[PDB]
Amino acid sequence: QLTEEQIAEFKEAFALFDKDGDGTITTKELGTVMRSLGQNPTEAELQDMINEVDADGNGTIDFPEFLSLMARKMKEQDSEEELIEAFKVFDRDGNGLISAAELRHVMTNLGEKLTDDEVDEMIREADIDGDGHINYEEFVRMMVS
Numbered sequence: 001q002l003t004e005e006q007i008a009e010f011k012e013a014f015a016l017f018d019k020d021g022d023g024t025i026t027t028k029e030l031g032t033v034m035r036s037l038g039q040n041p042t043e044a045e046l047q048d049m050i051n052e053v054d055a056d057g058n059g060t061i062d063f064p065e066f067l068s069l070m071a072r073k074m075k076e077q078d079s080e081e082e083l084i085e086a087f088k089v090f091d092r093d094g095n096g097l098i099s100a101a102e103l104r105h106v107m108t109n110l111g112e113k114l115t116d117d118e119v120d121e122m123i124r125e126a127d128i129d130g131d132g133h134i135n136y137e138e139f140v141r142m143m144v145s
């Protein structure tokens, strides 16, 4: 499941939070890590963050809990990065929007020679804000559906 080196890496990450090395991250120690990086969440906000990760409902995060989450997160990241890469290719001019001209061009490079009507239908179907283009959120919402 994990190598010793992965474990060690994860333990080093856990230690950043576990300011006192007691084997748990509290809402308070989370507050320290958030603050050091420029956020100042309320105790209510910290409690939600801990509650979302705290499996045994004991109020703090232990290493198996942290390890479990970071496996989740690292999957999510590999999913996301792929969606983002693909979007950026589709958006040839980098402007955050995939125009129909871009979509047609890249489809031609993917083996499909489409008409303007066909590509306009693809865009209509997926467009949410009405602008006749596809932004990242729109792009993701279609891809994962």
Ligand SMILES: [Ca+2]
Residues within 6 Å of the ligand: 017, 018, 019, 020, 021, 022, 023, 024, 025, 026, 029
């Ligand atoms: Ca601690």
Ligand SMILES: [Ca+2]
Residues within 6 Å of the ligand: 040, 041, 042, 045
């Ligand atoms: Ca806040």
Ligand SMILES: [Ca+2]
Residues within 6 Å of the ligand: 054, 055, 056, 057, 058, 059, 060, 061, 062, 065
């Ligand atoms: Ca716990």
Ligand SMILES: [Ca+2]
Residues within 6 Å of the ligand: 091, 092, 093, 094, 095, 096, 097, 098, 099, 102
């Ligand atoms: Ca574009």
Ligand SMILES: [Ca+2]
Residues within 6 Å of the ligand: 127, 128, 129, 130, 131, 132, 133, 134, 135, 138
């Ligand atoms: Ca749009």
